[PDB]
Amino acid sequence: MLMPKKNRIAIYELLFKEGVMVAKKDVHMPKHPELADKNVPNLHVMKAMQSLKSRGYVKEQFAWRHFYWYLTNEGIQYLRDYLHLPPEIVPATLRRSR
Amino acid sequence: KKSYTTPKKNKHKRKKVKLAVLKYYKVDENGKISRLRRECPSDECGAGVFMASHFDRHYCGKCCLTYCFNK
Amino acid sequence: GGVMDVNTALQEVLKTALIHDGLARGIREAAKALDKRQAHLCVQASNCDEPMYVKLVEALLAEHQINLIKVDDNKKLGEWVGLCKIDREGNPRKVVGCSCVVVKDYGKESQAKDVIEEYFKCKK
Amino acid sequence: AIHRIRITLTSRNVKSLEKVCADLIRGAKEKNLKVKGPVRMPTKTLRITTRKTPCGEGSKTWDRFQMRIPKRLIDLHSPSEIVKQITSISIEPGVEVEVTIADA
Amino acid sequence: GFYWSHPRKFGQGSRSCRVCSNRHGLIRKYGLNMCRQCFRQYAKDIGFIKLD
RNA sequence: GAAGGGCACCACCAGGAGUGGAGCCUGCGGCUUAAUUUGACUCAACACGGGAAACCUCACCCGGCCCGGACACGGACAGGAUUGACAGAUUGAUAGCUCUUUCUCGAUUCCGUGGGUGGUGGUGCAUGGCCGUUCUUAGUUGGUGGAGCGAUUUGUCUGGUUAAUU
RNA sequence: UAUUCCCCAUGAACGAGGAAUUCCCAGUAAGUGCGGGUCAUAAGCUUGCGUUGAUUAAGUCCCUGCCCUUUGUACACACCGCC
């Protein structure tokens, strides 16, 4: 609910599409593998996700300068209600196992 | 270390002006809108794009904020 | 849930157009939306000082690309669009007056969009 | 089919490279064809020499960080069975295996 | 999103440690790009073993 | 500045090589300098911090821009919160960073409060690791005995030996 | 604010270093380039590498500093002490 709308609305829906979103700690990328419709490097990603953790709707690791953004079960609500997404939703961890 | 004296000219952090902005819109009798002043040449700023009198400046604000000239 | 109460049929279309990113939301973008096919649906304010501003709306609205509604009061006219950051749990959120938006790209379909745009085009 | 196959065995661990290297000889000679045994290239010594000290000081002592990488290679002539048998068996530790088609 | 501009293309502007983003005593050789300390941490794991 | 034993060319002898003299290099000291950021002070500080630096580095000064103020908590529906502005005054800058004009993204914005977030800021006498070294010197320790009420002590040693309680 | 290099051109002190002091015994000292590291640019830096390759000690504790033993010690912030 913030920043460049086009870019950041896409970052949410990327993260909802995926189980896990890796990154790199580097402001000067103008891109990020998968998504990056346009620019949206670290910054627009970080600025979003380092928001998400501190309020609580995502959880971290860091590990050799990168940011290990893992999606929290509470965030499931925060971001799908942000994205009006269906009440089944199924983010990514549908996970057919055995 | 030093303790900063600062030459007494404490530079202004400035407001971008208050401005209601959109009152000056000539509604001649019934519903119809068009005034005249100076114009910009841009595409997202399509023909309606609008200009001025300052201590010089004039600017055009409609490829969101992308594109103010030099006048 | 979501069966359209009183003045909440415009609210879901405004809340889904808000979030679908495309609201020509004011005298300016409203008129530059009504100048093109960029316009679609709208919510004008009954109360309006110098009603030239409501007239510019009405006059454009009434052309081909037919729009309208009415909605009484300036002081209500926003909180069924997008305009609050959660700060404070009981929502006392914000508080000046409100006026004429232009709802573009509805939201997706259904919910309130078969209610209001079947009922407006054919008020019978 | 019969084509001029080269198998290039590159690894760090000499012992865990020459158990594999022997198994390709003994794997091919089982189903005999040809060979020209394991070739021994010069071993490349990846030699780095950094200061022991983080930060400045102390009498200047450095370490002598080394990694070896011995390459064996084995020529052969076979079909697309004997290659895909002998390569997929005798894998496992930190051992890289190349497979040249023929000649170049 | 504009301005943050130079040669970040050569010079230690560009290159930094992959582990910790410090920008001195850098093991350029051999496509490592570790700081010289970040060797002795991430060294055995790499493969450089101290022999003689 | 006790005594026996033993040992090291960071000791000497016997030398050569130098080194210490010159110019030059760059290391530091100082002065000077707005600035010559700075750590490192006998040895085990001084081409050492991998410390060969135009710009980056870089922190530091003379400026000057930029905000990247997370987060929440508050404040901001619309006579559009100011998201983001192509010619000139300028400014260094085509920095809307600012003095009118205004034309768009459009629920972002902005202003408080608490709180951060960094910081090549501080403190290596607040610490981890890593390093340096006393010190590639021969040393250190325990079980059982034996000695001491017991700290302790022998084992762990006169001598020959040995690079080395070997 | 000679970047680095070349091409010209000027063309210095030094004719073996005053008081001191480190380095080491065999492929050793020395010279000698050469790689590596440092690098866009680039090394008078180090770390390796051969190559050419000597003289001399092969012992002693005479100086400096280390090990043990015995001993003395008012030192135990340990003689850079204590007084």
Side-chain angles (χ1 to χ4, degrees):
Chain A
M1 65 309 168
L2 236 270
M3 268 203 310
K5 221 69 43 51
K6 183 220 300 300
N7 301 312
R8 232 253 251 190
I9 197 168
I11 288 295
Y12 276 86
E13 73 104 353
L14 158 61
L15 181 71
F16 232 98
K17 189 60 161 182
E18 311 304 53
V20 73
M21 182 255 290
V22 308
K24 176 160 168 180
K25 175 164 190 169
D26 165 35
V27 158
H28 309 243
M29 282 201 302
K31 251 183 185 75
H32 161 151
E34 207 197 56
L35 202 86
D37 88 72
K38 192 69 164 169
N39 295 201
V40 73
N42 199 85
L43 100 70
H44 312 158
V45 176
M46 197 221 167
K47 286 286 146 305
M49 297 302 124
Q50 59 119 342
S51 82
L52 275 306
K53 96 175 93 72
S54 28
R55 51 163 164 269
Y57 322 99
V58 82
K59 166 80 198 176
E60 288 269 60
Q61 255 347 311
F62 200 89
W64 302 67
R65 51 110 111 256
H66 247 216
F67 294 110
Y68 262 66
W69 283 307
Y70 139 87
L71 186 49
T72 52
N73 250 25
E74 208 90 313
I76 292 304
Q77 205 163 281
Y78 190 105
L79 316 162
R80 109 229 271 208
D81 133 358
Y82 183 90
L83 294 171
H84 72 53
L85 286 160
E88 286 198 326
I89 230 305
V90 52
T93 183
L94 185 156
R95 306 294 33 187
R96 149 125 277 188
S97 171
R98 277 143 41 79
Chain B
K1 305 167 180 179
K2 189 141 281 182
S3 84
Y4 206 58
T5 54
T6 231
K8 61 116 74 194
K9 192 185 288 187
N10 278 357
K11 292 206 80 180
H12 290 323
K13 194 79 199 175
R14 290 286 247 35
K15 306 124 70 186
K16 324 187 305 311
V17 210
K18 298 163 186 172
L19 310 182
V21 185
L22 280 151
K23 219 50 50 217
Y24 290 74
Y25 226 151
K26 186 143 281 180
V27 189
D28 197 34
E29 194 171 75
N30 214 229
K32 61 202 82 171
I33 38 172
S34 44
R35 52 144 164 236
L36 202 54
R37 283 274 201 64
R38 300 283 280 2
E39 288 98 62
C40 146
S42 191
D43 259 9
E44 284 207 3
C45 337
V49 63
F50 228 56
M51 311 207 299
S53 52
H54 214 154
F55 271 135
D56 175 77
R57 283 294 255 350
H58 255 32
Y59 49 133
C60 133
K62 228 57 151 212
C63 324
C64 45
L65 129 75
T66 332
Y67 314 38
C68 101
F69 220 38
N70 307 99
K71 225 172 195 147
Chain C
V3 298
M4 260 78 264
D5 297 38
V6 182
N7 48 21
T8 201
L10 229 163
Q11 303 194 153
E12 199 109 332
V13 179
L14 282 161
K15 291 271 183 171
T16 55
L18 168 200
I19 206 165
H20 203 87
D21 332 296
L23 226 310
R25 73 92 95 27
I27 181 53
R28 179 134 283 290
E29 267 201 288
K32 209 81 174 70
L34 269 305
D35 261 272
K36 310 199 293 180
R37 281 80 274 201
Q38 266 314 298
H40 256 203
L41 207 268
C42 165
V43 51
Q44 93 133 251
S46 66
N47 216 342
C48 180
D49 317 62
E50 55 187 74
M52 293 150 172
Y53 154 46
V54 289
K55 196 190 293 182
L56 292 184
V57 164
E58 283 145 16
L60 289 164
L61 299 189
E63 299 263 338
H64 308 40
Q65 213 294 135
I66 187 56
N67 169 269
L68 263 156
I69 207 306
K70 216 287 179 289
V71 176
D72 197 49
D73 248 359
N74 273 143
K75 212 74 89 96
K76 287 186 161 50
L77 214 158
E79 229 173 297
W80 3 282
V81 205
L83 34 96
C84 33
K85 270 251 281 169
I86 205 162
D87 358 333
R88 220 270 155 74
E89 202 205 6
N91 335 219
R93 275 268 29 71
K94 317 235 295 117
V95 191
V96 84
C98 196
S99 77
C100 314
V101 320
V102 164
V103 181
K104 327 187 282 185
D105 216 273
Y106 28 110
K108 222 156 59 183
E109 252 168 21
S110 85
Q111 299 287 316
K113 302 141 198 81
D114 259 345
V115 179
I116 67 170
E117 215 50 21
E118 190 274 305
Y119 159 166
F120 202 88
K121 195 180 170 197
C122 193
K123 282 194 286 277
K124 293 189 172 293
Chain D
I2 302 176
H3 63 307
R4 282 69 230 259
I5 215 84
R6 192 160 299 144
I7 304 174
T8 323
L9 291 170
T10 76
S11 191
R12 185 191 305 200
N13 285 74
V14 171
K15 205 186 172 190
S16 89
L17 188 54
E18 271 203 61
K19 78 167 181 177
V20 168
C21 190
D23 204 27
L24 313 205
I25 301 154
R26 297 195 64 82
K29 207 73 159 288
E30 266 183 284
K31 306 164 68 181
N32 53 151
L33 23 109
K34 229 137 182 290
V35 49
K36 276 73 171 289
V39 180
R40 258 141 240 154
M41 278 63 203
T43 187
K44 309 194 145 214
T45 63
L46 309 213
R47 234 167 27 70
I48 330 299
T49 33
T50 79
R51 288 287 309 245
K52 269 190 182 171
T53 312
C55 322
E57 275 213 353
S59 32
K60 293 104 184 206
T61 40
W62 317 5
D63 307 308
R64 317 228 25 236
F65 281 93
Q66 253 183 301
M67 181 209 291
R68 276 122 184 249
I69 164 44
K71 292 207 306 181
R72 349 258 85 213
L73 57 85
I74 315 177
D75 267 22
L76 277 181
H77 310 278
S78 29
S80 71
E81 179 194 58
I82 294 167
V83 173
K84 305 295 177 168
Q85 182 198 61
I86 294 170
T87 55
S88 69
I89 300 161
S90 81
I91 51 176
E92 264 83 12
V95 179
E96 222 277 23
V97 188
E98 309 246 329
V99 191
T100 318
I101 299 157
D103 288 45
Chain E
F2 89 161
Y3 284 12
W4 245 207
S5 328
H6 264 157
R8 205 88 34 235
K9 66 185 196 169
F10 56 64
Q12 50 263 336
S14 70
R15 83 194 71 68
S16 50
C17 186
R18 294 192 288 101
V19 210
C20 45
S21 318
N22 18 289
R23 316 181 39 253
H24 305 248
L26 230 159
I27 310 311
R28 190 81 97 78
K29 183 181 180 166
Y30 261 166
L32 271 97
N33 324 294
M34 315 283 284
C35 38
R36 72 203 185 114
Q37 284 70 344
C38 297
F39 238 153
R40 291 138 50 77
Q41 292 276 347
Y42 288 75
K44 283 292 188 69
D45 307 355
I46 280 163
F48 314 113
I49 163 160
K50 198 190 298 87
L51 301 173
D52 99 76

